[PDB]
Structures are given as structure tokens and as C-alpha cells.
Design an enzyme around this catalytic site. Structure first.
Site, PDB file in Angstrom:
ATOM      1  N   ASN B  78      66.515  86.535  12.832  1.00 27.70           N
ATOM      2  CA  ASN B  78      66.023  85.468  13.699  1.00 27.70           C
ATOM      3  C   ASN B  78      64.945  84.620  13.028  1.00 27.70           C
ATOM      4  OD1 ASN B  78      66.672  88.158  15.026  1.00 27.70           O
ATOM      5  ND2 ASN B  78      67.038  86.767  16.750  1.00 27.70           N
ATOM      6  N   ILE B  85      61.420  80.706  14.718  1.00 27.02           N
ATOM      7  CA  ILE B  85      62.056  81.958  15.110  1.00 27.02           C
ATOM      8  C   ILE B  85      63.095  81.616  16.172  1.00 27.02           C
ATOM      9  CG2 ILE B  85      61.724  84.260  16.128  1.00 27.02           C
ATOM     10  CD1 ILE B  85      58.787  82.487  14.592  1.00 27.02           C
ATOM     11  N   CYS B  86      64.149  82.432  16.263  1.00 28.28           N
ATOM     12  CA  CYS B  86      65.202  82.238  17.264  1.00 28.28           C
ATOM     13  C   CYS B  86      64.903  83.115  18.478  1.00 28.28           C
ATOM     14  CB  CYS B  86      66.574  82.542  16.671  1.00 28.28           C
ATOM     15  SG  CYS B  86      67.134  81.357  15.427  1.00 28.28           S
ATOM     16  N   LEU B  87      64.140  82.543  19.407  1.00 29.61           N
ATOM     17  CA  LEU B  87      63.922  83.088  20.739  1.00 29.61           C
ATOM     18  C   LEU B  87      64.396  82.101  21.798  1.00 29.61           C
ATOM     19  CD1 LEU B  87      60.277  84.291  19.958  1.00 29.61           C
ATOM     20  CD2 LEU B  87      62.035  85.820  20.782  1.00 29.61           C
TER      21      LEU B  87
END
Ligand SMILES: [Zn+2]
Ligand SMILES: [Zn+2]
Lengths: 82, 148, 99, 85, 94, 108, 99, 83, 109, 93
Positions: B78, B85-87
Site C-alpha cells: 500500500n 498510502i492506499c487507505l
DNA sequence: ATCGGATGTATATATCTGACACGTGCCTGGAGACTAGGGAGTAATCCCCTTGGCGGTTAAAACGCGGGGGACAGCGCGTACGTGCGTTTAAGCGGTGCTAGAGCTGTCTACGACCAATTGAGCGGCCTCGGCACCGGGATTCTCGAT
DNA sequence: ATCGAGAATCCCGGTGCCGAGGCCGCTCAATTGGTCGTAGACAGCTCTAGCACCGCTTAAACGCACGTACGCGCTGTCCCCCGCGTTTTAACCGCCAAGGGGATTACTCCCTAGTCTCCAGGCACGTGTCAGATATATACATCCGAT
């Protein structure tokens, strides 16, 4: 060949349609008039359905032909395709 | 201001009760800016590392999400090295009820378990799927020479 | 001594029953035969999908129910409760179907 | 009878409830909080993300957003916070 | 195997699992919803095409879709549909 | 928005932007199609779908059921004013009619 | 002693007169002012081509003529010769204009 | 330069003439207000679409084509002004 | 045919086949229009035009005039059953209405 | 300036073909132009929909013929189909 | 059943005016010749579903009867609408003046189509377990004849 | 105003079954990257027609009065729909069997798009004259009170 099948639309069936329509009391001459108008409507729809079928070089009147025929006359029907 | 009041409460709750394996504070004089720091949990291949991160609060808040970036680099599907970041919280699933402590706990939970469904970096996820041992050793060595 | 309902109550009972359900009201076989008869009037040696006949039945029933609603309003306008052929004729003429 | 001040606390703005509104998922929040969320956010629940697209239209058409049965209790039983908020 | 036929069933179920997270949907109801989606798509696209052809243009932009939505939808549905579309385009661009 | 994710999630939608773009391109509507038209159309369609589904689910909950059938869709459409005006010429299969009886016909 | 017609002959004469001509029946300036008022209700500072106002007038007058024909039939259906607002409302309902 | 209560310019003689062209013989006294309301509704419905059409083209004048297009969209074609 | 004269004369028409072909091609109807569609469409359009013009000329001569005004088109369209069915929702500017009075309204004998 | 195309000269040719004596005003010419455009749009749109339903990409003559059968009423449809068939047969040779 | 007023509508003649029908210049859109490629015609094969039949059971239709409630015709009242006259109002017509804005032209830059390699979103087929249909018994509530 | 009996409808608990929801495998359609030609965005200029004002006729709108004939309510007759019980017809369901034609695949060829060149058909503008509208004076059809 078939003959005089408009009488399969019986008196109780027309009474049930009227009951759903919200009718409390029905005269005696309603049934023939209802059969006539229903026959006219069926002729109008089935003619366009058959035209759509013949254009496609087919020999079965599919559900899509009926749906398109209904939509042509402003009677869009949901649940059978389209 | 209403936003300022929100940060003041969040300060009170945060100061009275620290989170687990989490630290945070104001980086600068202004109350808008923030900094924080995280560590890899015990059941993680990134154990022993210390990681800093920067937080910027937009003018409208908490209705708009805050910007969060990572200064350092970690070996996660992520994460990207640039700090993004991949949230789902950052852009899509942002909610005004969510707090800074909650999102940092979510980041720690993501560090605990990868979610390679939507990875920014392509090659890391496929290495993770094909062979876990190479993933683990690469993560270990990169934490050894970068986290400390 | 035998029990009898005054004329007009079973009619309201039927109205309440048939406006709560959704099933078709015309028998399937006679309608299928009528559709086939009209079609063979148009083009000879035709075949029909089951979905085609079902769609035709749904459309016809909806049309007739709407027509009967309009007919009922026309009948009430003239200070009556019975529906008569002239009510159907007036509703269709106003709707533009017969001109 | 009267709930405590802990549960009479808005979580969206960390302040006392004013003109509380309760979503169909039973999440109470300030009417200004609701208006700001509708204007800016994605027209959903700020807590569990249960979207109410037509509920807001239906109630704003008739002006029934406020949970009056709770607003009256909050105003009458705790007059101190309401005047200063 | 039969040839693939595309439909909106997956997305309609995804949307349904947001408004009511504990309610299922029948198969006939899904057919009806798919027909509704196709019908509204055709309406908006056709109105946009006529709108672009009227002004001697050649490109269907978001503006034509917005004006078509304003023309077709009723008074209070349009004011929300336009908001949803504008928000989506603004979020997608930046 | 930043790239490197699925084309729908940038807009936050659930409906497909790419399929709508292809349908607009290949539908014989216009010679060229903009880049921001499919997103707008997908957003509008998704909004309408959610609007119908919410009311249908409310009706299904009212009828003690946990599953939406065509009757619930017909109820949801007919009861709402705007949706009834929009879907005015449309017929729902197996939907029935709304229950009403003229006040003249009721017994006195 | 002065000569006057029984009530109904002059009305029939006017009916025969106005079904033979083709001109407009509403004065131009009041209609133009009404159109401008509604337009400024929608968007302010609008200019109107004369052909636009003429087309609006033609459409409105054709619509009202058709509506009055339907209203006359509705009035006649109830054993009457006078048109009353309930006839207009019924004709508008059956046409689907208000439903 | 606002305009107020101009619908009274649709006088009673004009409505009687419109009724006469339709074949009406006898008219009640309450027909005129109902007819005024019907005409107002129809005019608002048509002018809204015409103004939308003229706003899309970044123009400031309502042309005849906008009115014809609005009428055709509502389902009432008009011959003699173009199109 | 000789494949050398004008296309309308080659097909034996008065309406333009070239303009109809161009309008079909640039009208955003289909990807590629066939070669015989414009001829068929122009023939249909010319037939309908001739029909309406003939009926309107008959009406105008019945009114002792040598020109056709919109009234002479309204009479021709409304009197013919099929032309009225085709143009059912159409309003014709300056057309008037057909004269009829309900038999109930006429005076008692 | 700008050039505005119309069917006026062809309508006048047909009028002089039918009634050699009668003329035509300007309003009637505008009405005839509007009518021709309207019928063009109707038939072309129906043909396009027919071609799209069958997964074709051409508007051939039979698409136009079926559109004519679908739109026009009975005797009008029969005569229009006959006229179009005659014109297409004459054009091809 | 008429008859005479009295009114309104239709018919015959002069005249004069502006819109229709035709003619001229020209320029842009349609016609003629040629090339490339993909869309659609045609034949062959598979297998799905449409038609046709038989037997049974039973839900719905057809028929008859008694009666009460609704449709329909006739009377009477009076009030609201039609017709005609005198008066007040603003529409319609002409003429002039001003400028806002529609419409056309020239430059140019950014957006959208086209093409090729690649992989994951979404569709077809399978499987199972819970939601809904059905049955059977009881509780609740409108309905009508009798007070 | 009510009490009570017969009857229809709603609740509740237990059983079963089939279709809705989730999973697995795979193939093709959407994504990404690069290039190029042109659509439309913007600035400038022309000149058309939309808006505003003023003065004068006279046509249509308005207000008032008188009377009549049409709407509306009431009563009375009678007959025709309605509710109920009995018998008869054929719809509905399950099963088996055949083959028609819909749906897919492969091959090929010819019909349509794209490009260049050229020229004549139709569009804008100008001009004359006659079809139609208006004014004026009779002729006849129609309505209405009175015999
Ligand atoms: Zn709050
Ligand atoms: Zn919630």
C-alpha cells in the site's frame, strides 16, 4: 385455423379487471365493448411485433419484438428485457 | 474556530490517554500542522523500526479529510516511496466521526496485514503472492538498513 | 333465515382483495389461443416464445385496468355508480384513442 | 428520564447537541453538522456510512429534520449549555 | 458456452448494499432495475445528442449531459442529480 | 485526483465509467465524446438507482419481508411524486395498482 | 317593442363565425407582457424575438381550443349544456395532464 | 421594470371567443379563473424549457427555434416557424 | 439506367437524392449508409408531399382561390382520415379548426 | 452571409406537377418544409433503431421500407412502399 | 301554420397594393474515377425449446332464482347567464432613435481519436442453506337483522 | 342511539423446498502509453433588429339592467344487477417425445468510405404585375312575435 376465441375472455375475468380498476357496480353491456377494445389493442400491438419479427428473417415472435412494439406506442414495459 | 475547537478536544483526549505504539504532536507553532510516529508491531516483519509521518489539516475540517504523508520508506504493497498510502479513509471513505488516533490505529492495522487488492506499487504484491520467504527477507533487510 | 349480504358489500370486498394482489386475472390458455388467432391473421405459420405471450398478457391487463379507472371516473362524473358503454367511449375519445 | 451528558454529546463536533437530528440508523448529531455534511460530504451517515438520499429530500421538503422530542429535553433539562452554545 | 451478455446487476447490488445493508433483491426485481437503468441512459444520451446537433457542435461534453438532465428530470430530482454529477466530475478531475 | 487506481474509484462511484464511455462512443450519438461526460452520466444513473432502491427497501421492510420484489418497486415509484412523474408511462410487470376507492362508493 | 334574439341564437352565430376564421383571439400586447413576466420569473434580463412570442401565442391558443372542446364533451356527457370547472378538471385528468 | 398581475389581460371576452371556437354554447361564471390557471401552468412549462435551451447556447435572446424545440420536446409539434 | 444523367432524373424523382444521401450520412444515424436508401426515402417524401398538395389544391379550388394558404392545408389534413392519423399531434400555424356543432346544441324544432 | 437550404423548389415542382394552375403562399411553403423535415427525422430514426436492434451497421433500403411500414397507416404505407420500390428498381438499371 | 318586420348574411363591381413568380451572377456542394478493406452474405452444424399428446383433479365458469337498490322520467323553483346599450380604456398603427447582441472571420492550442501490448474486472457454471410459501388452528373484527 | 349471531380476515407455530448469494476458472475488454490532426475557444468587427418613446383613432373591454330557461332537488316506478346455491366444463399440472429453427463458426467477395478534381444547380438579390382584400350598394335567407 382458429375461430371465435374472443369469447375466452369471460364475464368473470372482465369483472375481476374492473374490480382491480376500482369499480363497484357494472352494467350488462360492458363485456362486449371490453372485448372489442381489447381486440383492437391486441391487433395494434401484434401487427408491429410481427413486422419486427419479419424484418429479422425469423419465424418466432420473441419477447424483444413485443417489448419494442409496446415501446413504439408509449407503453414501456419493465421486467421482460430492454 | 470550530475546527480549532475540534483539535483542542482531540488534544485533550490524546494527551489524557496515549495510544498503543503510537506517538503524535504538533510539528510547528500553528495548530493546523501535525507530526506523528509509528513502530512496527511484534507480529510484523518490520519490527524494531521507527517511522515518522506528517499531517496537514485543510481549512475545512473535519468534513474534509486531512493530508497524511510518510517521510521514510517501508516495504508494503500500500505504501509508495513518495509518501502516499492506499487507505480508503484518505479520499473515499473519509468520515467526520473519524479521529487522528483512529486513522493512525488503522495505519498500524494495515501494517499488521497487507491488502494487495489496490496496490500502488505493482511488483511487491506479486512477489508476496508467489513466494513469501523472499518477501520476508527483503522486508527484513530493508528495515535493517532503512528503519534504523 | 339464511344469511345474505346486502348488494354492494361483496363488491367492495372484491375491490379490496384484488387491489392488494398482483397476479394475472385472465386465464392463460384462452389468451394464448386468442393471440395465436390474431397472429395467424397477420402472418401464417408463426411461432411464439412463452415470454412473448406473457408480455402481451401483462400489457393488455395493465391497459384494461387503466381504462376501467378512467371509465369509473367518467361514470361518477355523471352522478352514477354503474359503468356503461358510453363511459368507455367518452374516456377513449378524450384520451384520443378513437378520435 | 434524562440521559447523562456523556451520551448528550455530539461526536462530530465534540460539543453539546443543538437541534439534534437522528438518522434512520439511529445516529444523533447537530443540525449544523448535518447541514455541513450534506452540503460538502457525500450525503451519507458520518458514523456508519448509511446513505440517506431521499430521506433528506423528504424531510427538508416538510421541515422535519430536528428530533424535537430530544431537543425539548436537552433545552429544558440543561438550560446552561444551550444559552452559551 | 453461451455468449456473454453484459448487465448492471453487479453495480445495482453494490448500490443496494449501501442503502439497506440487510436487504436482498429478487431476480425479477433486478431485471426491472436493469431495464430502468437502460431506459434512463437512452433518454439522457438521446437528449444530449439532439442538444449537441442543434448548436452545430460535434462533441458531447459534460455540459450537454447537465442540460439534458435539467430538461428531462422533474423539478427536485434534477437539482440533486446535477449536484451529484458535478461533485463526481470535480472529484474525478482533481 | 491522482491516477493509478480503477477509473470509477477516482470519482467515488460504483457504476462503471469505462462501460458508460464505450456505450456513449459506440451508440451513434455524436461524432466525438468528451472525457468528463461518462463520469457525469454514471453519477446521475447511480443517484437514481440509489433513490429507487431506498424507497423499495422501505416498502419491503413495511411488508415484513427482507427481499425486494416488483410489488415493492411499484409501491415505491407510485407513492413518490417525482418518481411517479418521471416513470409515468412505464409499466412494471407484476406490480399491481395502488389501493384506493372513491369516497362515493363507500357505504353510508 | 325593440327586437332582440332569444338566448342561444347569437351564441350559435358566434360559434359558426369563429370556426370559419383563422386569426388569433387574445390581444397581442397583454400576452406579450405575460410572457415577459414569466420569463423574468425564470431568468432575468431576457430579450424576446417577435417570432418566439408569436409561436408561444399560437401554441397556447391551439391548446386552449382543444381543451374547451374536451370540456364541452364532458359537460354534455352529464346531461347539460353549460361548461363548469369540474368538466375542465375531469378532461385534464383523463388526458393525463394532472393525473 | 418589474411586471405584476398581467394575467388579468386574458380578459373574459377573449376566453368566451376561445370557447366559441371550440363549439361551446353556454359558459358558467367560474370558468375564467380556472382557464387562467391552466394557461399559466402551460405557459410556465413551455417557457422554462425555452429558457433552458437559450441558456445552453450562451445566448441572451429567446429565439423562435428555442420555442419550437421546447414545444416538440413536450409533445406538441408546431409547423410554420421552422424546423 | 444510363448512369449519366442527374441522380434524381436517373431514379425518376423531383426531390434531391444527393442531399438526402448527405443528410443520412452526416445526421448521426448509422455508421455507413447503403446506396439505395436515399432513393427510397426521397420517393416516400415526394409521394407524401404530392398527396398533401393535391388535397390542399382541391380545397383551395373549392374556396375559389388560386393560392394555398395554411387553412387549405388544415382542411385537407383534418378531412382525410389517414393523413389526420399520421399528423395527429401536430399544430399548424394559422390553420383554424374544422366546423362542427354538437346536435344537442342546435335549437329545438 | 449564410446559405440556408430548403425543400422549396422541389415542393413547387411537385405542386406544378399536380395542379398546374394553383400557386402557393410563403406560410404554406414554410409549413411544407417543416412537414418534410419532420417525416425525414421520423423515418431516419426508426431505420437507425431497426439497424441497431439487429446488430447491423448499415441503413439499407429494406430498413427504410420496414420503417415506412411501421410509421405510416395502412393504405398510405402500401402506396409509399410501392413508390419507393419503383424508384429503387428504376435507379438500379 | 302563416304572415310581416327586421336583422344578418351572401353576392356583384371598382381599385389598388404588395407579395409571388421569374431572371441573373456565382460559388460551394455534389458528381466522376479509383483504391483498400472489412461488413455481411452463404453454407454447415449443434442442440434448445416449441409444439403435440394423455390422464386426472378440481378450481372456476355457467345457469337459475329472489329481491332490493339504482337508473330514469316528470315537476317545480329561482337564480345565474345571455343580450343589448352607453361609457371608459388601452390596444393598434405610424414614425424615429439607440445600441445590445447575434453572427462572421482569423489564430492557435489543447483535447480527443487511433494503435498495440497486457492483465484483471466481470461473466458462465456449481452448490448450498435460509427465506418464504403452505397448512392448520385460534383470535379479531366488520356485517346485518332485531330490538 | 344499541346487543348478538354468522362469517370473513389476521396471527401464530411448524415443515419443506428451491432460488438467491457466494465461489472458482477464464477470456476479452478496458487501461496505459505515444502521436497527430482539427474542433472550438478567444479576440475583434459589422450591422440587424430588439427596446423605448410619442401622438392619434377607434375598436374592443367594462359596467348595468331585464328576463328567461336551464340547473338542481324531490318523488315515484320498475327492472336489472347482485348475492347465493347447484351442476357442468375445461384450465392446470405433470410426463413423455420429436424436430424446427435459432445461435454460432468459417470463408470470401463486393459494396462502401476516403481522396482528388471539376463544374453546374440552387441560393441570394432585384423587378414587375395581378390576385386578393376592402369599400359600396342590393338580394335573399332566417328569426321572432301574433295570429
Ligand atoms: Zn455537532
Ligand atoms: Zn449511521
Amino acid at each position: 385455423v382458429l375461430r371465435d376465441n374472443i369469447q375466452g375472455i369471460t364475464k368473470p375475468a372482465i369483472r375481476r379487471l374492473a374490480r382491480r380498476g376500482g369499480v363497484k357496480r357494472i352494467s350488462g353491456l360492458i363485456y362486449e365493448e371490453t372485448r372489442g377494445v381489447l381486440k383492437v389493442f391486441l391487433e395494434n400491438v401484434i401487427r408491429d411485433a410481427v413486422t419486427y419479427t419479419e424484418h429479422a428473417k425469423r419465424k418466432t415472435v420473441t419477447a424483444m419484438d413485443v417489448v419494442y412494439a409496446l415501446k413504439r406506442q408509449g407503453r414501456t414495459l419493465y421486467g421482460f428485457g430492454g | 474556530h470550530m475546527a480549532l475547537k475540534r483539535i483542542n478536544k482531540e488534544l485533550s483526549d490524546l494527551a489524557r490517554d496515549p495510544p498503543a505504539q503510537i506517538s503524535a504532536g504538533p510539528v510547528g507553532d500553528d495548530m493546523f500542522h501535525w507530526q506523528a510516529t509509528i513502530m512496527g508491531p511484534n507480529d510484523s516483519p518490520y519490527q524494531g523500526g521507527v517511522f515518522f509521518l506528517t499531517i496537514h489539516f485543510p481549512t475545512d475540517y473535519p468534513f474534509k479529510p486531512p493530508k497524511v504523508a510518510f517521510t521514510t520508506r517501508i516495504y508494503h504493497p500500500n505504501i509508495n516511496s513518495n509518501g502516499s498510502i492506499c487507505l480508503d479513509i484518505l479520499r473515499s471513505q473519509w468520515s467526520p466521526a473519524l479521529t487522528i488516533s483512529k486513522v493512525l490505529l488503522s495505519i498500524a492495522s494495515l501494517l499488521d496485514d497487507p491488502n494487495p487488492d489496490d496496490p500502488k506499487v505493482p511488483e511487491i504484491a506479486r512477489i508476496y503472492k508467489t513466494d513469501r520467504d523472499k518477501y520476508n527477507r527483503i522486508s527484513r533487510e530493508w528495515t535493517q538498513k532503512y528503519a534504523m | 333465515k339464511p344469511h345474505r349480504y346486502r348488494p354492494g358489500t361483496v363488491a367492495l370486498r372484491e375491490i379490496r382483495r384484488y387491489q392488494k394482489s398482483t397476479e394475472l386475472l385472465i386465464r392463460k390458455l384462452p389468451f394464448q389461443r386468442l393471440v395465436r388467432e390474431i397472429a395467424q391473421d397477420f402472418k401464417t405459420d408463426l411461432r411464439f416464445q412463452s415470454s412473448a405471450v406473457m408480455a402481451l398478457q401483462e400489457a393488455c391487463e395493465a391497459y384494461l385496468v387503466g381504462l376501467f379507472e378512467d371509465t369509473n371516473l367518467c361514470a361518477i362524473h355523471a352522478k352514477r355508480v354503474t359503468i356503461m358503454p358510453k363511459d368507455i367511449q367518452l374516456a377513449r375519445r378524450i384520451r384520443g384513442e378513437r378520435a | 428520564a434524562i440521559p447523562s451528558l456523556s451520551e448528550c454529546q455530539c461526536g462530530i463536533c465534540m460539543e453539546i447537541l443543538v437541534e439534534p437530528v437522528t438518522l434512520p440508523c439511529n445516529h444523533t448529531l447537530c443540525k449544523p453538522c448535518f447541514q455541513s455534511t450534506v452540503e460538502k460530504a457525500s450525503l451519507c451517515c458520518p458514523f456508519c456510512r448509511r446513505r440517506v438520499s431521499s430521506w433528506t429530500r423528504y424531510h427538508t421538503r416538510r421541515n422535519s429534520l430536528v428530533n424535537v422530542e430530544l431537543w425539548t429535553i436537552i433545552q429544558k433539562h440543561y438550560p446552561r449549555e444551550c444559552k452559551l452554545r | 458456452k453461451r455468449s456473454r451478455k453484459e448487465s448492471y446487476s453487479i453495480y445495482v447490488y453494490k448500490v443496494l448494499k449501501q442503502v439497506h445493508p440487510d436487504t436482498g433483491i429478487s431476480s425479477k426485481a433486478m431485471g426491472i432495475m436493469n431495464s430502468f437503468v437502460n431506459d434512463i441512459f437512452e433518454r439522457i444520451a438521446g437528449e444530449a445528442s439532439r442538444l449537441a446537433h442543434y448548436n452545430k457542435r460535434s462533441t458531447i461534453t459534460s455540459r450537454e449531459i447537465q442540460t439534458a438532465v435539467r430538461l428531462l428530470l422533474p423539478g427536485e430530482l434534477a437539482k440533486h442529480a446535477v449536484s451529484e454529477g458535478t461533485k463526481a466530475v470535480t472529484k474525478y478531475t482533481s | 485526483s491522482a491516477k493509478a487506481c480503477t477509473r470509477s474509484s477516482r470519482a467515488g462511484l460504483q457504476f462503471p465509467v469505462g462501460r458508460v464511455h464505450r456505450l456513449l462512443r459506440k451508440g451513434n450519438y455524436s461524432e466525438r465524446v468528451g472525457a468528463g461526460a461518462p463520469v457525469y452520466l454514471a453519477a446521475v444513473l447511480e443517484y437514481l438507482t440509489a433513490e429507487i432502491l431506498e424507497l423499495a427497501g422501505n416498502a419491503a421492510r413495511d411488508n415484513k419481508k427482507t427481499r425486494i420484489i416488483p410489488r415493492h418497486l411499484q409501491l415505491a415509484i407510485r407513492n413518490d411524486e417525482e418518481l411517479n412523474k418521471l416513470l409515468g408511462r412505464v409499466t412494471i410487470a407484476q406490480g399491481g395498482v395502488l389501493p384506493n376507492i372513491q369516497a362515493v362508493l363507500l357505504p353510508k
